[PDB]
Amino acid sequence: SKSTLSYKYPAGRPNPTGFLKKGDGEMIKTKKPSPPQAGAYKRRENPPNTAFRR
Amino acid sequence: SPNSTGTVTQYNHPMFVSQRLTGNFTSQFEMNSLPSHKYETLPIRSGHLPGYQGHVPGGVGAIAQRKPAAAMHTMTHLATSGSLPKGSPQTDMSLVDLRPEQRSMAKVYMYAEGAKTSFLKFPTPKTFDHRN
Amino acid sequence: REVISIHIGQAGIQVGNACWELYCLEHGIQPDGQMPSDKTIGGGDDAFNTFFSETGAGKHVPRCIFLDLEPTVVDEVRTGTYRQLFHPEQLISGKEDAANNFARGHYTIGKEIVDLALDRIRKLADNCTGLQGFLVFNAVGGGTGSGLGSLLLERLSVDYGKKSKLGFTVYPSPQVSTAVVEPYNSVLSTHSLLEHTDVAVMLDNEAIYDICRRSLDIERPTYTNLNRLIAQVISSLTASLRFDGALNVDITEFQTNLVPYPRIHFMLSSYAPIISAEKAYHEQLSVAEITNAAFEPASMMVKCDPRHGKYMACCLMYRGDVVPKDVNASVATIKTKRTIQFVDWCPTGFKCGINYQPPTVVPGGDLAKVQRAVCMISNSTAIGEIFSRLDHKFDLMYAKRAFVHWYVGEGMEEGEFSEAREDLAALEKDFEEVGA
Amino acid sequence: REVISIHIGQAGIQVGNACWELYCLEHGIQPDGQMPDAFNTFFSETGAGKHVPRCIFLDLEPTVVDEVRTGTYRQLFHPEQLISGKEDAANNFARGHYTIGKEIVDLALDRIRKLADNCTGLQGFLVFNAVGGGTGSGLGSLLLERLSVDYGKKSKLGFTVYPSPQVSTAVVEPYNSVLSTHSLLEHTDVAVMLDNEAIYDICRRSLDIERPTYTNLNRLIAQVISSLTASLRFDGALNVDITEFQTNLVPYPRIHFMLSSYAPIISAEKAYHEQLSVAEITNAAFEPASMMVKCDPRHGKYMACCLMYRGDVVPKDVNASVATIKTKRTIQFVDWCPTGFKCGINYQPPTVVPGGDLAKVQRAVCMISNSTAIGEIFSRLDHKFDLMYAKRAFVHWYVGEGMEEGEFSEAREDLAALEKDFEEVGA
Amino acid sequence: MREIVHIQGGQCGNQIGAKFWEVVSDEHGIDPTGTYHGDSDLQLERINVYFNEATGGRYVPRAILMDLEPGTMDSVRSGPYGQIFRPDNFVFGQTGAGNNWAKGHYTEGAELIDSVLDVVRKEAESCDCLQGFQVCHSLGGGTGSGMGTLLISKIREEYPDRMMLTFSVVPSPKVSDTVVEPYNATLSVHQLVENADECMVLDNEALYDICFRTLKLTTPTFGDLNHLISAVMSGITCCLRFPGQLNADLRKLAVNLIPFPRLHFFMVGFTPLTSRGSQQYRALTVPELTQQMWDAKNMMCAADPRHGRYLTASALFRGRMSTKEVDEQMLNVQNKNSSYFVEWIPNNVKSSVCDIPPKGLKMSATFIGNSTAIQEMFKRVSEQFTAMFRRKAFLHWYTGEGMDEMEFTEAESNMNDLVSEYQQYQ
Amino acid sequence: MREIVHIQGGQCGNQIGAKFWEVVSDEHGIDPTGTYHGDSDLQLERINVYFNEATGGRYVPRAILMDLEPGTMDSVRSGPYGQIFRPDNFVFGQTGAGNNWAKGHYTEGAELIDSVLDVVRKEAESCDCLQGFQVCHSLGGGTGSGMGTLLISKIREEYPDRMMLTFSVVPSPKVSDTVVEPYNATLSVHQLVENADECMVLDNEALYDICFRTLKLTTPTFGDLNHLISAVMSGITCCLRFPGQLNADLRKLAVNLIPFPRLHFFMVGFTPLTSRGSQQYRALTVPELTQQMWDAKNMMCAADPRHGRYLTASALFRGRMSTKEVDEQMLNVQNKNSSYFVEWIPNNVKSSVCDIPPKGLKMSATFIGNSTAIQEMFKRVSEQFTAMFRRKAFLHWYTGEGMDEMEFTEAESNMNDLVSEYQQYQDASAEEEGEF
Numbered sequence A: 001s002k003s004t005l006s007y008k009y010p011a012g013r014p015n016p017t018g019f020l021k022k023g024d025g026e027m028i029k030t031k032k033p034s035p036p037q038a039g040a041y042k043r044r045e046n047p048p049n050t051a052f053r054r
Numbered sequence B: 001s002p003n004s005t006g007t008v009t010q011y012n013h014p015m016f017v018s019q020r021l022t023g024n025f026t027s028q029f030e031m032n033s034l035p036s037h038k039y040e041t042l043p044i045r046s047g048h049l050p051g052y053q054g055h056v057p058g059g060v061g062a063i064a065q066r067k068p069a070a071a072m073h074t075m076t077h078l079a080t081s082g083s084l085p086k087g088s089p090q091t092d093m094s095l096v097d098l099r100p101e102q103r104s105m106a107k108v109y110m111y112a113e114g115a116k117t118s119f120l121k122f123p124t125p126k127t128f129d130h131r132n
Numbered sequence C: 001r002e003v004i005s006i007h008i009g010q011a012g013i014q015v016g017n018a019c020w021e022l023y024c025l026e027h028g029i030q031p032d033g034q035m036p037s038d039k040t041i042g043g044g045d046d047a048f049n050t051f052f053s054e055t056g057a058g059k060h061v062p063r064c065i066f067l068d069l070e071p072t073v074v075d076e077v078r079t080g081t082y083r084q085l086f087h088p089e090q091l092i093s094g095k096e097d098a099a100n101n102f103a104r105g106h107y108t109i110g111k112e113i114v115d116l117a118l119d120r121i122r123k124l125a126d127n128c129t130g131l132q133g134f135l136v137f138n139a140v141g142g143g144t145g146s147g148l149g150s151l152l153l154e155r156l157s158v159d160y161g162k163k164s165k166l167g168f169t170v171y172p173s174p175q176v177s178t179a180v181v182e183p184y185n186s187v188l189s190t191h192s193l194l195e196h197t198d199v200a201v202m203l204d205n206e207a208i209y210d211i212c213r214r215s216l217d218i219e220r221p222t223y224t225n226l227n228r229l230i231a232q233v234i235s236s237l238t239a240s241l242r243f244d245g246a247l248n249v250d251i252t253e254f255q256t257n258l259v260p261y262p263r264i265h266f267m268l269s270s271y272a273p274i275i276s277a278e279k280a281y282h283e284q285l286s287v288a289e290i291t292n293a294a295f296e297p298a299s300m301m302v303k304c305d306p307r308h309g310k311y312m313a314c315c316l317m318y319r320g321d322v323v324p325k326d327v328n329a330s331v332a333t334i335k336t337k338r339t340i341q342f343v344d345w346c347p348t349g350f351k352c353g354i355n356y357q358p359p360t361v362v363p364g365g366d367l368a369k370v371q372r373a374v375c376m377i378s379n380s381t382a383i384g385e386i387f388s389r390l391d392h393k394f395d396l397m398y399a400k401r402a403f404v405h406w407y408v409g410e411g412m413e414e415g416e417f418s419e420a421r422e423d424l425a426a427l428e429k430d431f432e433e434v435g436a
Numbered sequence D: 001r002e003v004i005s006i007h008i009g010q011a012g013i014q015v016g017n018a019c020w021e022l023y024c025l026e027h028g029i030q031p032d033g034q035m036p037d038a039f040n041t042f043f044s045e046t047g048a049g050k051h052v053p054r055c056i057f058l059d060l061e062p063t064v065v066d067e068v069r070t071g072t073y074r075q076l077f078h079p080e081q082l083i084s085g086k087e088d089a090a091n092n093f094a095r096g097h098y099t100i101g102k103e104i105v106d107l108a109l110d111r112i113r114k115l116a117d118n119c120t121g122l123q124g125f126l127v128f129n130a131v132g133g134g135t136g137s138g139l140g141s142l143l144l145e146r147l148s149v150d151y152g153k154k155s156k157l158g159f160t161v162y163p164s165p166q167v168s169t170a171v172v173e174p175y176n177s178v179l180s181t182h183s184l185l186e187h188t189d190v191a192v193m194l195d196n197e198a199i200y201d202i203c204r205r206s207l208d209i210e211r212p213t214y215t216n217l218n219r220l221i222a223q224v225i226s227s228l229t230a231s232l233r234f235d236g237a238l239n240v241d242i243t244e245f246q247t248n249l250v251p252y253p254r255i256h257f258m259l260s261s262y263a264p265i266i267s268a269e270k271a272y273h274e275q276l277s278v279a280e281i282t283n284a285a286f287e288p289a290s291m292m293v294k295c296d297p298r299h300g301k302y303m304a305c306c307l308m309y310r311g312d313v314v315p316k317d318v319n320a321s322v323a324t325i326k327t328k329r330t331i332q333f334v335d336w337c338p339t340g341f342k343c344g345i346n347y348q349p350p351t352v353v354p355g356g357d358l359a360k361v362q363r364a365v366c367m368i369s370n371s372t373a374i375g376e377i378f379s380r381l382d383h384k385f386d387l388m389y390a391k392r393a394f395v396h397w398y399v400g401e402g403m404e405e406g407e408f409s410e411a412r413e414d415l416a417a418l419e420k421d422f423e424e425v426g427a
Numbered sequence E: 001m002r003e004i005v006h007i008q009g010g011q012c013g014n015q016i017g018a019k020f021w022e023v024v025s026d027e028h029g030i031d032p033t034g035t036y037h038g039d040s041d042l043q044l045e046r047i048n049v050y051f052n053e054a055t056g057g058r059y060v061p062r063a064i065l066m067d068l069e070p071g072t073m074d075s076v077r078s079g080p081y082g083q084i085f086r087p088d089n090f091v092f093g094q095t096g097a098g099n100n101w102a103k104g105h106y107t108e109g110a111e112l113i114d115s116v117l118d119v120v121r122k123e124a125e126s127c128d129c130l131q132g133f134q135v136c137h138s139l140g141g142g143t144g145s146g147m148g149t150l151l152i153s154k155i156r157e158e159y160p161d162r163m164m165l166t167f168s169v170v171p172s173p174k175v176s177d178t179v180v181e182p183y184n185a186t187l188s189v190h191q192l193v194e195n196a197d198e199c200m201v202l203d204n205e206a207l208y209d210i211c212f213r214t215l216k217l218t219t220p221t222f223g224d225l226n227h228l229i230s231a232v233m234s235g236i237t238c239c240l241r242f243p244g245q246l247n248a249d250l251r252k253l254a255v256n257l258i259p260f261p262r263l264h265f266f267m268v269g270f271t272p273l274t275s276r277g278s279q280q281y282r283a284l285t286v287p288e289l290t291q292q293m294w295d296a297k298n299m300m301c302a303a304d305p306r307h308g309r310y311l312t313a314s315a316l317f318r319g320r321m322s323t324k325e326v327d328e329q330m331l332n333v334q335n336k337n338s339s340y341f342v343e344w345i346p347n348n349v350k351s352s353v354c355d356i357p358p359k360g361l362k363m364s365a366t367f368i369g370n371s372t373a374i375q376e377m378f379k380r381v382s383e384q385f386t387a388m389f390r391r392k393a394f395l396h397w398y399t400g401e402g403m404d405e406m407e408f409t410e411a412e413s414n415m416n417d418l419v420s421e422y423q424q425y426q
Numbered sequence F: 001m002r003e004i005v006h007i008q009g010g011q012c013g014n015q016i017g018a019k020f021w022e023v024v025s026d027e028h029g030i031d032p033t034g035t036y037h038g039d040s041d042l043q044l045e046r047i048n049v050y051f052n053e054a055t056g057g058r059y060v061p062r063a064i065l066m067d068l069e070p071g072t073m074d075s076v077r078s079g080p081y082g083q084i085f086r087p088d089n090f091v092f093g094q095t096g097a098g099n100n101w102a103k104g105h106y107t108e109g110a111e112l113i114d115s116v117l118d119v120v121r122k123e124a125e126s127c128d129c130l131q132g133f134q135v136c137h138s139l140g141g142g143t144g145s146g147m148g149t150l151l152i153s154k155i156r157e158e159y160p161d162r163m164m165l166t167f168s169v170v171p172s173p174k175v176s177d178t179v180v181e182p183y184n185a186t187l188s189v190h191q192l193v194e195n196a197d198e199c200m201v202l203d204n205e206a207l208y209d210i211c212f213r214t215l216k217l218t219t220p221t222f223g224d225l226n227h228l229i230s231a232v233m234s235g236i237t238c239c240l241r242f243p244g245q246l247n248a249d250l251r252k253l254a255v256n257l258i259p260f261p262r263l264h265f266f267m268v269g270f271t272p273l274t275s276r277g278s279q280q281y282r283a284l285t286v287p288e289l290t291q292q293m294w295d296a297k298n299m300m301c302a303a304d305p306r307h308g309r310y311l312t313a314s315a316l317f318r319g320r321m322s323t324k325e326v327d328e329q330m331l332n333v334q335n336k337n338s339s340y341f342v343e344w345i346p347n348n349v350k351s352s353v354c355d356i357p358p359k360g361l362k363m364s365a366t367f368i369g370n371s372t373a374i375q376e377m378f379k380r381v382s383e384q385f386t387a388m389f390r391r392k393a394f395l396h397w398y399t400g401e402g403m404d405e406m407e408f409t410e411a412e413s414n415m416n417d418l419v420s421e422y423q424q425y426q427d428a429s430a431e432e433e434g435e436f
């Protein structure tokens, strides 16, 4: 977001199944990202293809 | 009535910075009268009050001056901006802070903001060529 | 009574060039080096002799040496306004930087230049007659200001020993900073600024930003507006040497009346009134008023809260239209407040000092011509937190040994990093043991 | 003998805007701040050749404050003494009392503290506000509470502006007025009402201005406050200080609501045909056509009255006139007090502003009384509060700001108790 | 300091906004190229509310112009006062809406609203103290109503505490542009009762009535109607922009006019509007302004206020005048008409004065009366909607896009119970 | 004083060098004829950092051009500012590498590098105090990659303690431009990880992205890409050529960016870029600079920092600016998006301010961010390399020229370990227990 230096999630898409009910106008008045994993310590797989097995 | 520093060098200062010089950029002080209107050492009749919440046309022009001095300098900038070329540079030697290094006005410290260049001008569709 | 000042590094020279801009205005010395024909603004034919040395006929050259490794800033002084003033052999300059590398400036690059400086500082201290001491300026962030700034001090300790060496540092701010290695340079230097300086004065840039923004109403500030109101602090704690006062205070008094123990010498500056020209003449400032304004946490030149600690011993320089009746009238009230408190075993407390010369204004500067001003210099256990915050982020990096491969490549070893850290951890207990 | 004057809200600043013009004109102070001891009660002499006033204009909308900063008296005030927020309170008591007050009041009262510390012989404070708005009423109330817990034993004269019975320039001001009085009861010491319909009628009847604006209202209000502070400023045969008001006009610590009046309000030409003596201006100060609050004291009973006199008055006939008034039967005094007058005389005649509509008269009277016609005003406001509250109109604004129905009900019953007190004491 | 972020949606919104920025730029003395050339320095002090300084006296509006087809914005930019808008503020659609509320709210908003939210969010946090947003759109069109409505929902979701004005033109059966006018108006009002803070109802019937009865023009092109709406919008936010004796900001006005959270549909009127042949036979006094204000021929809605009761009202005056005449006039017109004002609210009229009239006029005024006659316009919309919805006319271009019929039934229920409570309070 | 010896390799290198010598020569005020025409005393003072003033008053760059075909020699002689080069530093083979790292590093290298090194040795001994060698090349071809790599290794073994910049473009992810792209890039980076001091990574793909979205150019030629890269290089080395309130040279930036000796692959952005339309309407303020500077869509690389935590960052601003604003913007961007910054380094951002902007602009900035999201490039390149190598495509063109298969296997394994180290220093925590 150029406006506020904070990275922000994009707004959810409006769905037709979920419309605007009678009172949700008052629900409004009353009404955080991270780098994903880059997992370094997780177990890398190893298939049984070793030359010794062969 | 811009100030004339007694310093002389090979080049001349650009008009967009020589046309607007304050009393501070002299070679020789007036040891007798430091508090005076020459050096903006007395309250400026012009310049808004420190609390003023109106809109002053400077906004971000001045960088290290107090509100009244900043407003004075920016107003004088917009005032004599008429005699300058049309797309004149936006900054000025008065708006920029006065460093003890450079009060003597020895060298040409502020010229880049106005030099004719082709630095970051990418080609327009009419001027576009594939370098045949 | 002559004192010479060395400026060490990018910050040392920039600060110094505003400090010397000021003195030339205090004693009517035009930038060409000499006082004018007419217009004898000053009284006292001797006053300048503690900073300037009159050479031959009509020429006052400073007692100072700008020293640095990069030739980029010194050569701004060589051709600035004061081309005439600073004589050529004091603007020392090297060829390649220490580059934010304490070890590089202390072991590799410092050694070939330190001999040139310590041979110059000699034949300055020889032209002198009654050398009071030195006062050094540096920032403990970079390499030049930290590496040889420490190496220079140590060798000054051998050649002189007892001559006072005032320390005006510019410490890294808690969060608003410009470097990354500055936790490493700050610890490695203080460990050697600990046992060689006589009085050290902390100074954080950010806590000076908040002053200019709030008090001087400068929306966008810059290093000049900081280096400007630093000389106003140097000017004030030395005006007792230059001009006559009702109750004066010399350099050897600071050391005696502020340092309870040989290692606890770090001072909390302050100043008042810091006020612009527009509010200067509307709000009368009485000797009892400004001394109040010189004790709030909102007016310290360091970003530490004096409420977390107990004042040990304060110092108060007044200037201008001040009589000793009111000085003692106000200091009475300050001791009576309950928001500030002295340590148990210091019942005496303050040390005042009055000088008749009002502070001078710097044209194009920011302050106003003031009737009377104060330059408070305290000594509290409030810094006891500063090193702890500065310790936390040092050890935060050292556990991965980040950035270290640079320092050992230049001649250090992993010993210095440790032996400097357990020094700082020991210094913290000292501020704790005292505060009991 | 120094009195600092705070101004809260859009009406407070404009009232003080005419007040300080009058003060600079009475002491001959140039607008840039210097003369070409008597002034010591208002303008502190700072440094040298500079007199800064002991006032604070504070507001939440920056429009009128920075109009002052641009006007003629740039150089008179401090730059730092004109407090102003960034956004208004918008005729909302709760918004001005709990949302924005909480950030502006601390800077305000930490400014007044060093104003009071600059002072040495502080007589007291005096506050200027209108209870119709949000800034005047909301943080006005909040400031008065924190003044009462800070100083307490000092006087706090309150010159408030209530809503008129039919004239009104808002809709929710009854809610703001009732919520304001719940603190105006027990926090101000001496509260002087000032309606606007009464001042409109005065300007139309006496000054014959067919098109009066708020400036003329502010100017004659400034005449009233200047006339009752001239006892401290200028020297007279028999003058009082601020502490005499609460001593001779407040019989009980909860009955302090003073009808103000003034005489003579006379134009330039009507003056030629009328003799201005002590007899008729003391009589005309008691007619309901020359009071600043719209209420009919013929229905009420006077509890205590104070008469400030300015000009060429020696006590012989002022004692004669108050004697005739005491014998008159048109107006009645309460049994609880047989001698209900407090006279005060001052030598200096009231000055005039060039371009003002008031004539230069040699003698004047500022009457400040106490009655039960105020007990009529509170009911006339109570009725039109109960009309709106019975339908829960406009409530969601205050509840959204953070209040509840409790403060509405309890402030309404506070007015009921005040009414019960006035009908008890009037007997 | 207080900032108004302007938002234009659709064709009417873009053309109304074009005339709006032409009038405001003239009031602040900035010429069409973008430089300040005023006379008094009263004008500089309050142009942050509407402009941002670019480079050397270059002030650019704080506006966001959106629609699903650049066809209207091409004519907007091609006209005079075209170089002032920043090229980044324009936002684009390649498809086009076509009077289809579903197309404007479900299929094209789904990829348009993210970009315009980025533009609004950037323009909203560039400034320091937001006053609120101000929207101009229609209730009959597709990209005005649909896109504008979703924007109101998103903005009120993100910045809930700031104000929001909506100038919306409503449809009438006699000035009936589109055929799906009820299907768009009904769904739009259903959203506006739950999202907007206050809505000022406009319509072309009353605008023609004004231009032919009062102005007595010959050929009232749309430029003049757009000017009338423009003069109204400027008159609303006048008090923010100029110093006044009794200031009235946007929030100040909303709290004095809206007694209950659902009753925020105002009818507006502007004065003085007299023909150039009758500017000789008239005067300009506050009585002349008030007599013309309260006349029902000078409203800008198709609802006769004397078919019901004024709940509250507001009057913003401009120019040097006497507050005594202002107050006694409001009091007189309230006492004399004792039947058109509600009983359980005394002093139903809020008044305020500002000291700078529009250029070339001595004295002006603007009226915002929250009446209860606005439910007559909601009935003439609701009954048309039932007439079509009973038999599924034009319904499939909505249903075949994703919308369900429960949105229609619910839209009818909120319209019907809202007119029920209007009728209750009368 | 400080000196930068410039070296250009291959076709990409030579075109970038032509553009870079044009912008710099114009920055310092010399016309295409080589003569000086400036207006600036501050222009002459530090030109020796790039120019050797030949007799007759004509400044020539300190650049050495190398390749294996005379076509690019003719090209760089042809264009404007092309006859400013000394015709003896145009060293070139005659066969051609043929996009073959083996030919560039073993056969034609070992034949041309000798004369190249003779020229470089002469050019380096010309000046007194070398700051560094700058090397502009590519990583796709043979003579740019292989020959440039051989040259880097020779220069390091000759001058073991001088700075070394490598401006390298890398193969684009989505659209390649050479079938042997991975086979070249793998060996090249395997050597760069050992010899170079810092490598600034570029990408034509990101350059197109920028020129098409931000600049909103209809048709960007290669001129504009080289233009942007030249602007970036001028920015990164300005601080040596101009005096600033806070200075930062090459060695200082290296010390402050590189925490561990293997992590010296940066990513670059430049600000402000704006189409001539919006240029009329936007105002140049430090907020407007930093907002575009920190944008991920502004980096001139294929690495997107949303996939990794910024290890460190550096920002060189140019133009006269508020240090308070600079530092507060840095603090805000560091504190709001706190999860995207590494934990065990407090205050990850270095800042510097040079007082002279690029001509015509009021104010500008350059960003150099060392991020752990740069592992994407190596992971992609390594998987493509192994995809080709498992079936031995195109391998004979290298194998039948001296290289074995052990060389390829060793290079792939070294790249595969560099990426694992990136992963470790990304996912490491401060408390050190949580990750297990």
Ligand SMILES: Nc1nc2c(ncn2[C@@H]2O[C@H](COP(=O)(O)OP(=O)(O)OP(=O)(O)O)[C@@H](O)[C@H]2O)c(=O)[nH]1
Pocket (backbone or CB within 6 Å): C008, C009, C010, C011, C012, C014, C015, C069, C070, C097, C098, C099, C100, C101, C139, C141, C142, C143, C144, C145, C146, C170, C171, C172, C178, C179, C182, C205, C223, C224, C226, C227, F245, F246, F247, F252
């Ligand atoms: N007060 C003040 N501090 C400064 C100024 N300039 C730099 N600094 C401080 O200096 C620190 C960095 O060291 P520098 O003085 O710039 O340079 P150095 O100390 O000589 O170290 P090297 O540049 O590597 O030789 C920064 O953290 C700043 O806090 C200044 O003008 N005023």
Ligand SMILES: Nc1nc2c(ncn2[C@@H]2O[C@H](COP(=O)(O)OP(=O)(O)OP(=O)(O)O)[C@@H](O)[C@H]2O)c(=O)[nH]1
Pocket (backbone or CB within 6 Å): D008, D009, D010, D011, D012, D014, D015, D060, D061, D088, D089, D090, D091, D092, D130, D132, D133, D134, D135, D136, D137, D161, D168, D169, D170, D196, D214, D215, D217, D218, E245, E246, E247, E252
């Ligand atoms: N006597 C007098 N009354 C005034 C004047 N100006 C405003 N008022 C009164 O003020 C009342 C409303 O409150 P305001 O002062 O206008 O506004 P506020 O008190 O600041 O509250 P906000 O508008 O929310 O900021 C109105 O009923 C007016 O009668 C004035 O100049 N003289």
Ligand SMILES: Nc1nc2c(ncn2[C@@H]2O[C@H](COP(=O)(O)OP(=O)(O)O)[C@@H](O)[C@H]2O)c(=O)[nH]1
Pocket (backbone or CB within 6 Å): E009, E010, E011, E012, E015, E016, E067, E097, E098, E099, E138, E140, E141, E142, E143, E144, E145, E169, E171, E176, E177, E178, E204, E222, E225, E226
């Ligand atoms: N006052 C005014 N009304 C307009 C203008 N253009 C269209 N309208 C009205 O707006 C309605 C049609 O709006 P429309 O163009 O369909 O909105 P959109 O297609 O969603 O942008 C009709 O009732 C018109 O009377 C205009 O320029 N001025």
Ligand SMILES: Nc1nc2c(ncn2[C@@H]2O[C@H](COP(=O)(O)OP(=O)(O)O)[C@@H](O)[C@H]2O)c(=O)[nH]1
Pocket (backbone or CB within 6 Å): F009, F010, F011, F012, F013, F015, F016, F099, F138, F139, F140, F141, F142, F143, F144, F145, F169, F170, F171, F172, F177, F178, F204, F222, F225, F226
């Ligand atoms: N930026 C830029 N890159 C180029 C240019 N010409 C070629 N390249 C890049 O160079 C790579 C091909 O390498 P090549 O030029 O054959 O290297 P060489 O044979 O050693 O000179 C491709 O990825 C191109 O993107 C240019 O003019 N500008």
Ligand SMILES: [Mg+2]
Pocket (backbone or CB within 6 Å): C009, C010, C011, C142, C143, C144, C145
């Ligand atoms: Mg340095």
Ligand SMILES: [Mg+2]
Pocket (backbone or CB within 6 Å): D009, D010, D061, D088, D133, D134, D135, D136
């Ligand atoms: Mg108000």
